[PDB]
């Protein structure tokens, strides 16, 4: 092993991933996993091949990852949401939409079956929705038009009609929160900064793909963007990013996440405080702040973004963002403590079972590979593989539990032109070698073979490193899934 981690270092849980970017995260908790959906941050380039600042040009997909344990993330690839203009090579799902910013996700049981709803903003001009029968698709655009526009009753007055947050209440009623921006264009007055009156909530119809009644204004002090809703001990918490302009009081610091409470999902809301500083306060610089609060496996968390991967690569964040998660703490009086945003993140919640099929694109740390949609036969919805594998690259999972009896063999589904090796090591990239899988020539990068090799000395709980070697260039092999067998 020679390659180094970009930003998510071994033993740390933030950023969640560093093999690509992901902005504007939101969480779905479903059947023992947390799924994180993100804006598709992706580098823009000058004609000479140098990086330029993020202008959101590439925000036409939604990236999805998931975890059972907060450390190992399965990469589920990209949903080609936007279908207008150049978007997604003709494969875009929403043909009316040129962009898919800042997703929100909801699940609702309808007629005995769980149904999934992905909301997004078509830049600052409207909100769309896609539907699916699984959290990872495939996705349908049932309307063919935005769900919410400036003509939707109650939505006049919104400056940026974006950043949706959809919440399904305990009674099954969905609510859509959206909006932001500050009125007054290039020069808002102090009062316009203080009360933009651009946040909205509208009730959804039972089917989650329509609205009922009119939107209500939420008078979030110093509103900017990034609506969020969570419910704690019977109280509704509307959270949002506080704006950056005008003078601000000590209790409404610029660019931080503010929150308000109500006994009802549509208000009236009362400002309570703020609980997440700007990512720049923790990681350097500054930029936009986007978050979602959720409860997964009986703990409260917030997912947010920071420029921690781009900064590590370039020495400047340049507006390119990555997901992070940290614990969020409610006090006895219902107030929320400041979130201690950091790199350590959340300690692994549960071990990984290495005796099931585990996708190769399910990993905790890597140095340095890519993931992409796979040609491998079978596999899960939108199955990916690990690629851009060169000599000395590696991936690792956290806390695989081999059990007392341990492992007998290791299987890997691989495709390779010239061949190579996968070393299976415990604890560290140079740790105990328990097996070496010889990747043969399979006939090419799209011709797949499941290879089996011996394993010995793999018992108990360990980080597991898969270290890639070979003499060729460039791509040694593609790697789809693996599975150990029990001794
Ligand atoms: O076309 C519109 C976009 O331009 C608009 O982008 C917003 C631009 O401001 C961003 O917030 C900045 C974060 O960094 C701070 O230092 C700055 O003071 C902020 O202005 C915001 O996150 C973007 O959404 O979005 C709406 C589009 O219609
Ligand atoms: Ca796979
Ligand atoms: Na969001
Ligand atoms: Na590589």
Curated annotation (Swiss-Prot):
Its main location: secreted. Disulfide bonds: none annotated. One of its GO terms (cellular component) is extracellular region. It is an enzyme of class 3 (hydrolase). One of its GO terms (molecular function) is alpha-L-arabinofuranosidase activity. It catalyses: Hydrolysis of terminal non-reducing alpha-L-arabinofuranoside residues in alpha-L-arabinosides. Optimum pH is 5.6. Stable from pH 4.4 to 7.6. SUPFAM superfamilies: Arabinanase/levansucrase/invertase, Galactose-binding domain-like. The record marks 163 as: Important for catalytic activity, responsible for pKa modulation of the active site Glu and correct orientation of both the proton donor and substrate. The active site is at 24 (proton acceptor), 225 (proton donor). Cleaves arabinose units from O-2- or O-3-monosubstituted xylose residues, thereby assisting in arabinoxylan (AX) and short-chain arabinoxylo-oligosaccharide (AXOS) degradation. Is more active on wheat bran AXOS than on wheat water-extractable AX and rye water-extractable AX. Does not display endoxylanase, xylosidase or arabinanase activity. This is Arabinoxylan arabinofuranohydrolase. It comes from Bacillus subtilis (strain 168). The gene is xynD.
